[PDB]
Structure 1
Amino acid sequence: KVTTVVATPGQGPDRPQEVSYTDTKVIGNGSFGVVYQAKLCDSGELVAIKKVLQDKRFKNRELQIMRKLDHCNIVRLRYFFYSSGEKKDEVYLNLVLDYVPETVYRVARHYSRAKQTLPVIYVKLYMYQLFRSLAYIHSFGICHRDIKPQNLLLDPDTAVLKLCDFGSAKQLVRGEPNVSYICSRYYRAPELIFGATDYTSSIDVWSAGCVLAELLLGQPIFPGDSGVDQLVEIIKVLGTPTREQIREMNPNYTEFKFPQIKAHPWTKVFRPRTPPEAIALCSRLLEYTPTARLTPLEACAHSFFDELRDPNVKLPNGRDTPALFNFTTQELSSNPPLATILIPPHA
């Protein structure tokens, strides 16, 4: 019932520390390993414990990356420790992380299954915090490579969003190739489908655009049945990519031949009452040419998020909005002048 381990703190002084926890239960199992909920005996706080078999055959920088990160929109790593487990001669890594009760996937599904869509204030708040989280990691050159609603945790009372699951993440280095079959299919950037190994952090921006469109639509905008059919789904919205767009995606595939299909108007992709600013923003994320997509910090600055910078904005439940403007130098480093838009005069 009470488990006591000696664990290393996620950040700060390296000295190991005795940690006890109880009330453990499984909250999810899959390709990511097993994630448990538990309660810290010391403080009584709920935590998540992610348990991952250490398998040389599968690359994984999750611990390395998480020990470096400290941001209000990224799930915090509290401790880590090694243990035995199911495979009775191998070693498991255990990550003790913050517990966050909901996910964007479940909250969106709640409306979608009732033939509603997520109220617009929450689309603004969640998308904005996701772009903040992306601006933060991209400033270290770290690409998440698995942005999707299942990996976005939410506190429904405070509207705080926290990015999680860095099992696919990697520090991208110019000139060093990266694997092309990456990202969950529906959220996979087209340059990855075209087999690019020299891609950049903008593949996360495409995935974020897929999340935004999905929150506006009530279902994935690009529900491909296969790695290849994923491209067909994209084309049936954006139209057939031109030769130059393919050259921007992967120079080695420009001779690609596909039937000529014209784009579907953005204003007809979404239902009539969709806020035009959200459509506008979506059109600048879901672009074939990877360098044409907005950067996360540019996205934060988009007019779609102006309501969040209003001094009188409030959560529907009457509470104040969460922290939105406590930008750091590291966070603003891609475009420091942008602070004058991102940080409103009242903050």
Structure 2
Amino acid sequence: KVTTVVATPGQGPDRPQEVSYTDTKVIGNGSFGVVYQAKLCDSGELVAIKKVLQDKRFKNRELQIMRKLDHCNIVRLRYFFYSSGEEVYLNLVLDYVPETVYRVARHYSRAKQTLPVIYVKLYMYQLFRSLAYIHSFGICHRDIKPQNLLLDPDTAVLKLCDFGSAKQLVRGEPNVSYICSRYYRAPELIFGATDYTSSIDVWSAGCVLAELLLGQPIFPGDSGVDQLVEIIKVLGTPTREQIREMNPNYTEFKFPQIKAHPWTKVFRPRTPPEAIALCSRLLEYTPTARLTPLEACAHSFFDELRDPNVKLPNGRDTPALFNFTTQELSSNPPLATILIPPHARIQ
């Protein structure tokens, strides 16, 4: 069954093209709708088609955001088009990526092994770079989690996906507190704050890092109260001040009174001290105290990636990690001093 549509390219000027695809199969369901895998007739390349009901009232926010993004660590929007399906549907045609951090982490966990630190470095670095890029537009993802981190195992390339929760945050304009997924929610979201910032993504990324190092989620729980107890067990009880910077009116509630557990005793003995240091600077109560994504990229944990001699275990080169644009560096241009190693500067 060959399907043919006239679709609009994700990037560049509006110049629709005939696109034919076949071998359609479902690779995902959700509240949003359905994600299909398909094969393009022209090139044989695989795509993922995210199909969602289209609101008659306004432009789709996810589409508007994805048409603005162009970055090697963000899943590319190849085309989009509208169609029927019983009401009108928006179809987002994305590059298909063969793996996710969720699935890879599960494979190691079930095999009683941990992902090699070199991959933890590579994946988390690319995640932080994707965040530096979107944040520089004021855009917050709001649902960072392993299932939304696509991986190409052969090239070790990570790509951020699912911009269905993403939003341009504006200071003084309220946002829904109920975004972000179980295990990965910043404490200010748990406290129901509506005035949060892009640093909620940095907390979520910190949970992903911790999880890759531990082999399991660092703050599990099916309720916010369970998640908060797990957080308090590590960070200790938050001060009245720390509570004020997460959500006022949570000032006077009764919290568990636990002393902070030393970060080193959280992870296995073999865990590199730089990884632990990095976790502690991401997983901070006070949102403005967390590292920015660009500062995270510059962290000592990623020094190995900047070594001119670094290679993948496959033998392959690492992906391009150093070609930062002015846009990517804009939150703190002199960080390029660290971010771009001497060998990446040879003319």
Gaps of at least 5 residues in structure 1 are none
Quote the offset at 1:256 in angstroms.
2.5
Measured against aligned partners, the alpha-carbon deviations of 1:149-169 in whole angstroms (never above 9, x if no partner) come to 000000000000000000000
CA contact (8 A) 1:133 1:163 kept: yes
Measured against aligned partners, the alpha-carbon deviations of 1:225-267 in whole angstroms (never above 9, x if no partner) come to 2133222221122111110100111133222221211122111
Q: Name the SS for the 2:90 alignment partner.
A: strand
CA contact (8 A) 1:48 1:99 kept: yes
Change (3 A) 1:296 1:80: same
Q: Name the SS for the 1:132 alignment partner.
A: helix
Instruction: Using the aligned pairs only, state the percent identity.
Output: 100
Measured against aligned partners, the alpha-carbon deviations of 1:287-327 in whole angstroms (never above 9, x if no partner) come to 00000000000000000000000000000010000010010
CA contact (8 A) 2:9 2:17 kept: yes
CA contact (8 A) 2:187 2:285 kept: yes
Moved more, 27-36 or 192-201: 27-36
Distance 1:115 1:85 in 2: 44
Q: Name the SS for the 1:186 alignment partner.
A: coil
CA contact (8 A) 1:9 1:15 kept: yes
Quote the offset at 1:196 in angstroms.
1.0
Change (3 A) 1:255 1:276: same
Quote the offset at 1:85 in angstroms.
1.4
Query: RMSD of the TM alignment (CA)?
Result: 1.4
Measured against aligned partners, the alpha-carbon deviations of 1:273-294 in whole angstroms (never above 9, x if no partner) come to 1111101100000000000000
Gaps of at least 5 residues in structure 2 are none
CA contact (8 A) 1:60 1:168 kept: no
CA contact (8 A) 2:4 2:19 kept: yes
Quote the offset at 1:31 in angstroms.
2.2
Quote the offset at 1:56 in angstroms.
6.7
Distance 1:62 1:152 in 2: 17
Moved more, 191-200 or 126-135: 191-200
Distance 1:12 1:231 in 2: 45
Which runs of structure 2 are paired with 1:278-297 in the superposition (5 Å)? 278-297=275-294
Q: Name the SS for the 1:28 alignment partner.
A: strand
Distance 1:344 1:57 in 2: 49
Distance 2:33 2:125 in 1: 29
Change (3 A) 1:205 1:121: same
Distance 1:206 1:183 in 2: 11
Quote the offset at 1:55 in angstroms.
4.7
Distance 2:58 2:212 in 1: 32
CA contact (8 A) 2:232 2:256 kept: no
Quote the offset at 1:59 in angstroms.
10
Distance 2:60 2:196 in 1: 19
Quote the offset at 1:346 in angstroms.
0.4
Quote the offset at 1:73 in angstroms.
0.1
Q: Name the SS for the 2:279 alignment partner.
A: helix
Quote the offset at 1:20 in angstroms.
0.6
